[PDB]
Design a protein around this nucleic acid. Sequence first.
RNA 1: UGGAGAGUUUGAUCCUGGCUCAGGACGAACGCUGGCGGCGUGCUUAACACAUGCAAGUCGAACGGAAAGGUCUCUUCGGAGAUACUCGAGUGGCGAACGGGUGAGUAACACGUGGGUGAUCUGCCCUGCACUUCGGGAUAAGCCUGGGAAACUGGGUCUAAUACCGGAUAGGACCACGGGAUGCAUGUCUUGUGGUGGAAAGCGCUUUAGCGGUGUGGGAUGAGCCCGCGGCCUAUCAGCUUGUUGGUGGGGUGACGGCCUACCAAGGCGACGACGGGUAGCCGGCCUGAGAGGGUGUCCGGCCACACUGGGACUGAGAUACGGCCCAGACUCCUACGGGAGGCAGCAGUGGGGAAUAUUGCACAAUGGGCGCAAGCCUGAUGCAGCGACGCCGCGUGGGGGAUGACGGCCUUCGGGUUGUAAACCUCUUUCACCAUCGACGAAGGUCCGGGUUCUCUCGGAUUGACGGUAGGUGGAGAAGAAGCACCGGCCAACUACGUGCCAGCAGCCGCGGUAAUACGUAGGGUGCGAGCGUUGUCCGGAAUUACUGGGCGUAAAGAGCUCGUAGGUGGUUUGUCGCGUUGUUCGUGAAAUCUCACGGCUUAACUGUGAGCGUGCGGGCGAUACGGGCAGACUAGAGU
Lengths: 200, 85, 113
Amino acid sequence: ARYTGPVTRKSRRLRTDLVGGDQAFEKRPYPPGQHGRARIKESEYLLQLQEKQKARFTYGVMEKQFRRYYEEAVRQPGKTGEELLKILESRLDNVIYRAGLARTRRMARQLVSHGHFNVNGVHVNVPSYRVSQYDIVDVRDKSLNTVPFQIARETAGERPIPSWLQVVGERQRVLIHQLPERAQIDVPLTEQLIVEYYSK
Amino acid sequence: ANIKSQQKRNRTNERARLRNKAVKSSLRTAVRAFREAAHAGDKAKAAELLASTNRKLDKAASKGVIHKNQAANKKSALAQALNKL
Amino acid sequence: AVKIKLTRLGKIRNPQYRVAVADARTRRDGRAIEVIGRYHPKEEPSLIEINSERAQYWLSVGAQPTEPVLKLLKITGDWQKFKGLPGAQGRLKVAAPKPSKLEVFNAALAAAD
RNA sequence: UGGAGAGUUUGAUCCUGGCUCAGGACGAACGCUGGCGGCGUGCUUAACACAUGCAAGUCGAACGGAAAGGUCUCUUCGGAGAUACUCGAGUGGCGAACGGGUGAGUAACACGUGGGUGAUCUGCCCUGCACUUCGGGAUAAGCCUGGGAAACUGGGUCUAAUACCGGAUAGGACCACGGGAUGCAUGUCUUGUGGUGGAAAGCGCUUUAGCGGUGUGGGAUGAGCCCGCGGCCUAUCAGCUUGUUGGUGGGGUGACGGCCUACCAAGGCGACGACGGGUAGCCGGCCUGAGAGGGUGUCCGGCCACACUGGGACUGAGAUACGGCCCAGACUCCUACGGGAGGCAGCAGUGGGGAAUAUUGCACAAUGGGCGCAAGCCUGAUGCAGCGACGCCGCGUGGGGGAUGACGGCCUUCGGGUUGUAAACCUCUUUCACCAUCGACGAAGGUCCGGGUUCUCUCGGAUUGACGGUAGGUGGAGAAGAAGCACCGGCCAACUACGUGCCAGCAGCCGCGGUAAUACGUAGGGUGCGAGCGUUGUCCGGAAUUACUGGGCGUAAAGAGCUCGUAGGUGGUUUGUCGCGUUGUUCGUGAAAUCUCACGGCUUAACUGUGAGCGUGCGGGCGAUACGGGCAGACUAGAGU
Ligand SMILES: [Mg+2]
Ligand SMILES: [Mg+2]
Ligand SMILES: [Mg+2]
Ligand SMILES: [Mg+2]
Ligand SMILES: [Mg+2]
Ligand SMILES: [Mg+2]
Ligand SMILES: [Mg+2]
Ligand SMILES: [Mg+2]
Ligand SMILES: [Mg+2]
Ligand SMILES: [Mg+2]
Ligand SMILES: [Mg+2]
Ligand SMILES: [Mg+2]
Ligand SMILES: [Mg+2]
Ligand SMILES: [Mg+2]
Ligand SMILES: [Mg+2]
Ligand SMILES: [Mg+2]
Ligand SMILES: [Mg+2]
Ligand SMILES: [Mg+2]
Ligand SMILES: [Mg+2]
Ligand SMILES: [Mg+2]
Ligand SMILES: [Mg+2]
Ligand SMILES: [Mg+2]
Ligand SMILES: [Mg+2]
Ligand SMILES: [Mg+2]
Ligand SMILES: [Mg+2]
Ligand SMILES: [Mg+2]
Ligand SMILES: [Mg+2]
Ligand SMILES: [Mg+2]
Ligand SMILES: [Mg+2]
Ligand SMILES: [Mg+2]
Ligand SMILES: [Mg+2]
Ligand SMILES: [Mg+2]
Ligand SMILES: [Mg+2]
Ligand SMILES: [Mg+2]
Ligand SMILES: [Mg+2]
Ligand SMILES: [Mg+2]
Ligand SMILES: [Mg+2]
Ligand SMILES: [Mg+2]
Ligand SMILES: [Mg+2]
Ligand SMILES: [Mg+2]
Ligand SMILES: [Mg+2]
Ligand SMILES: [Mg+2]
Ligand SMILES: [Mg+2]
Ligand SMILES: [Mg+2]
Ligand SMILES: [Mg+2]
Ligand SMILES: [Mg+2]
Ligand SMILES: [Mg+2]
Ligand SMILES: [Mg+2]
Ligand SMILES: [Mg+2]
Ligand SMILES: [Mg+2]
């Protein structure tokens, strides 16, 4: 299942703008509802729950799928908040966002889900594909001369492309150099509170 | 019975029982006759009914009626009754 | 007596197999006496490995192979070097060596520059 | 590489200490709701009673034969001709002791683990050496007849064999006396002489078809028996045992053995729990946990036990003999009343019990098994499908813009706030379903017929797939067919209005409701999840509330009224030694699966393959001697005189 609801409503509760730029946010940066402007009680469980909610609705990942990401983030060496954002970033719909082939996160999910992309010449239609090192992310030969794909051509300059992937020319195909460590990950969220949420 | 081969085998398990029982009873009435001559202290028939009792045991062991380690255990016991008389 | 047989231990639509030495009075996935190989009949040629110094031990001592394992020991050549046939070299063939994952990535960087 | 706390004793406090909750899991059930696919899984209670079909056969290359089919016939026109490929019934060989099910019994060498067998067995398979030799008498079937209601059965004639029985020759059978090797006491293996003995079988042939038979040395596999250590509650069970503990002479067995028997000795076990009572199949594993521990034994895999209840042998290499035999018992059924028949804890299925668990499905294509030289036949093992959100995993129910921030609902301090970029509207894209169409991999094989030096082998073809016209590819059409459930006083994320007035009712705790209820009922709003969400049952955690890791006992629960002493636990200084504990290292073992790591394959993931760790242990060889302990001494500080 997907959320399929209002997107500003879960950017107002978390007090943090989740999608890239929003005018409905910053007119009302307080949580929604009829009791929207009230003084909230700053608990410790609230700081740990809402920080996990920043990570789910930024990426569009349900709870029984986000929990399995934690079950292998704590089990790999290194840290836990590092490798949690590493395996969340390598989802293929998040690759289409960072490569500048989509406007928001919810259309980068459809363009993978409706089957507009290959990887190694293999037709994928799952958003939760985890790209490894040296993967090419190619677009289908049929899906050129298409309206949402030609709008991603001239608009390849307004958002920064991270250093862990590379976009090339007239073939809009994405080359994955390595899995990103920390620095080229965009930060609306702190990472140690998601690790402390599941410790309860 | 119910299976076609099982009626076949019931008829052959009884042919084999009547065959083997006649051979085992011939061994018991030939070891016993040695025990008469050995208990009387004869040494005349006991030296030559041993040679016909052990020969009946080896023929019963080649016909599958008794096992070969059973024939060896009965020939060793009758021969050690001869050497002590 | 002693057989050399296969053991189905894959998924539902992926019948993996192992070449295993077992008694005839045993179910398929029972205790093998010794596992000596494997057979994956889903790749484009096949994926066949026989240990070839343990398959010579069990054939010399009396293990009767079953009829689909007999076709495998003729292919790898372990049957011909036991009965003394002139097909003693292995006539098995491996899959086509694909260009590796690093090679395609360097081919794509040079394709743009 | 891995440990979280909160509420509640009081007017208030600090300790002690119970109770309760948040977490995870499930063979599940119930409630509301419900789109799909992948993959697992599904009588936990009555080892309760079972209708119907199926679940074990096969060989004419063992034998007599000719009931069925195809041929050669004579020829009635619907009967004759075994001579003849093929074959019902029958004899004979092998199989039927495997596979499949269930957890009633068992507290035991049943199981796990490591050994012993100088105390043993082992069909078929592989290999070394000899051999495959003379005869004989019958019988099933067939045919003719007697008894019986049936199930079935008596008699007379008649015919074979790889059926059966009797001889000749053949050491691993026996007895006596010797050598040569080894040790772990009985002994064991190898050889020599004398005296005694044991076997069998042929059939087929396009004319280098071919399959078998028997005695033995040696392997391989399977199995039996014995022993060390390991895993439940109970002392409100304290005396159990007479073939019981041991010896000798016999008997028995595949084999050691009171396993059995006759005499002789008077032992054997027990406070380290004998004898008894309660319960339970055991393990790899599974769930929880920071680990140590605690609960459990369900799928899968190993082993054990049982097949309507209780006993018993037979056949065979091998028997708890599930779909065998005999007897007794209970219960169904036939009968002419004399007598007979049956055992789903095989796969589906019905009744019943119950909170609750499915189809009287397809296929022998793949893999395993039985027989056969082989083609083949058999296989409810198995491969699959049907059904149930029962569980895990994955994806959808739209996406990008969009303020005059509309209508409606709700709240208001009557200015507005909120649902809310959410709708309306413009616009883009078809994953899944939906329609049309193409169409698999599982099959370097199974068969036939061409080329092959025989074995083998391909140029290369005819054909052979239950799942299946499925998965998957392609084409079409349009936002089109697709969201619910609990909770919102604290724990614990999320609050207002109205109805209600100790009533109706809520609740896990302590508490809420007696006319302004953030706790009851409804609406709006919100939060957590999402094809699910909640309740109940059950176990682990939190519980350092059984504490070894890891607690206590002056007054909170807790020092026996006090001493003496048995078993047990514990031990000062020092020299030497053995190397049991301890410790180092190495080989054997610790099955596979599951589990952690790393790559690889299903579009991802679950799932699956491979490699390495893990397997805390246990056995064998070789090192170390500080400490503990055993052995042989010394010393005076503790203790006694
Ligand atoms: Mg899900
Ligand atoms: Mg037969
Ligand atoms: Mg008599
Ligand atoms: Mg004896
Ligand atoms: Mg008080
Ligand atoms: Mg109070
Ligand atoms: Mg319903
Ligand atoms: Mg049951
Ligand atoms: Mg016949
Ligand atoms: Mg035969
Ligand atoms: Mg059985
Ligand atoms: Mg005759
Ligand atoms: Mg002779
Ligand atoms: Mg003879
Ligand atoms: Mg007595
Ligand atoms: Mg004796
Ligand atoms: Mg005795
Ligand atoms: Mg029981
Ligand atoms: Mg703990
Ligand atoms: Mg079981
Ligand atoms: Mg069961
Ligand atoms: Mg029953
Ligand atoms: Mg016998
Ligand atoms: Mg049977
Ligand atoms: Mg039955
Ligand atoms: Mg049944
Ligand atoms: Mg009922
Ligand atoms: Mg088959
Ligand atoms: Mg087969
Ligand atoms: Mg389902
Ligand atoms: Mg339900
Ligand atoms: Mg399509
Ligand atoms: Mg709160
Ligand atoms: Mg009120
Ligand atoms: Mg309420
Ligand atoms: Mg509960
Ligand atoms: Mg504890
Ligand atoms: Mg508890
Ligand atoms: Mg205490
Ligand atoms: Mg004290
Ligand atoms: Mg007091
Ligand atoms: Mg007190
Ligand atoms: Mg006192
Ligand atoms: Mg006392
Ligand atoms: Mg002591
Ligand atoms: Mg000391
Ligand atoms: Mg293992
Ligand atoms: Mg992968
Ligand atoms: Mg695995
Ligand atoms: Mg050792």
